[PDB]
Amino acid sequence: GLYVGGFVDVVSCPKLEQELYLDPDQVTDYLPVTEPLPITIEHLPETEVGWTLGLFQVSHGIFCTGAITSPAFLELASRLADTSHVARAPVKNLPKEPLLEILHTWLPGLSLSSIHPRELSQTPSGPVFQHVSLCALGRRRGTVAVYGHDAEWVVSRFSSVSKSERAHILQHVSSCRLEDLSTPNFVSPL
Numbered sequence: 001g002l003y004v005g006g007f008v009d010v011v012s013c014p015k016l017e018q019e020l021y022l023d024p025d026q027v028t029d030y031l032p033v034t035e036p037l038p039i040t041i042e043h044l045p046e047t048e049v050g051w052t053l054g055l056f057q058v059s060h061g062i063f064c065t066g067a068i069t070s071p072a073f074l075e076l077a078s079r080l081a082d083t084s085h086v087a088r089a090p091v092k093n094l095p096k097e098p099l100l101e102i103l104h105t106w107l108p109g110l111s112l113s114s115i116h117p118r119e120l121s122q123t124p125s126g127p128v129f130q131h132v133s134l135c136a137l138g139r140r141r142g143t144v145a146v147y148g149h150d151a152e153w154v155v156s157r158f159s160s161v162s163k164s165e166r167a168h169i170l171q172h173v174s175s176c177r178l179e180d181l182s183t184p185n186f187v188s189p190l
């Protein structure tokens with residue numbers, strides 16, 4: 001049961017032809033988000049690996065905490081972390097927690113999908129946000145994602161997040177269902 005945390009990049013209509021990164025203040029009026037959004041890989045819909053636990057505007061940007069819950073994904077990633085020379089090649093030698101290091105290295109980016117800013121000028125009809133993706137490429141404003149086994153340790157890793165902000169983030173995290181979160185749809189290509 002893994003947690004992920006970090007500052008996100010906000011991307012409108014990602015993957016499509018007219019993709020556009022957004023200024024955080026273009027969506028901060030629609031934060032915070034406390035209902036769970038799917039966490040996918042690289043904006044691919046059949047790769048749900050978990051669920052967000054909170055998206056909060058904070059001095060320095062928009063912070064995401066999430067839970068990685070897919071058994072198929074966690075088993076695949078942990079197996080690779082323990083047996084794959086390829087997975088371990090770009091990580092420091094002999095790390096204590098290989099799974100956390102491999103995710104921190106290979107999926108450093110958190111990317112929040114939003115509707116186009118034209119819809120954001122005047123009263124959106126429906127949900128502003130669609131998902132958060134763990135991404136191999138495309139990190140700009142976001143921090144490098146931190147993966148851990150407890151949410152407190154994860155949020156702590158960001159000095160750009162004050163004691164108060166960290167208390168607020170953690171408040172909504174503990175109130176979130178953990179075993180009640182629906183099962184994500186990721187299937188192992190192995």
Ligand SMILES: O=C(O)c1ccc(NC(=O)c2cccc(CC3CCCCC3)n2)c(Nc2ccc(F)cc2)c1
Binds near residue numbers: 077087103107136189
């Ligand atoms: O169609 C194919 O055969 C196929 C081919 C290649 C694939 N991936 C990459 O090239 C790739 C590149 C960068 C990062 C990642 C994420 C992964 C890194 C290692 C630890 C777990 C996270 N995957 C995938 N996608 C993939 C999904 C999860 C996973 F654990 C491994 C691969 C599928």
